[PDB]
Amino acid sequence: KKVIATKVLGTVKWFNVRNGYGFINRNDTKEDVFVHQTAIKKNKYLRSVGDGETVEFDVVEGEKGAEAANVTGPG
RNA sequence: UCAUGU
């Protein structure tokens, strides 16, 4: 996998804690990026984000598609 | 329980 962007801001569309993934909409391109629970930095759902939350992340591209990495609060 | 849940 390769890093294709860093310090991207986005808004969480939805995140399902049962299945452990969701999608973030990038504020710069308006495209959704997949986010898995393991990509979220520790905040008891130790790795989760909330629907509607603004987050900052890197985008990396394995060939299942573009996915978020190192997901944190803005700044 | 790793690609659009409900």
Q: How far apart are CA A24 and CA A20, in angstroms?
A: 13
Tell me which residue range forms the domain holding A36: 1-75
CA of A64 to C1' of B5 (A): 18
Q: Which nucleotide is nearest to A17 (CA to C1')?
A: B1
**Main-chain phi, psi angles of A32, to 5 degrees:** -75, 145
**Interatomic CA distance for residues A74 and A72, integer angstroms:** 6
Give buried/exposed letters for A22-61 (b at 16+ CB in 10 A, else e): bbbebeeeeebbbbbbebbeeeeeebbbeeeeebbbbbbe
Q: Which neighbouring-strand residues pair with A65?
A: A62
Declared resolution, Å: 1.6
d(CA A47, CA A70): 11
Q: How was this structure determined?
A: X-ray
C-alpha A24: how far from chain center: 5
- The number of domains in chain A is 1
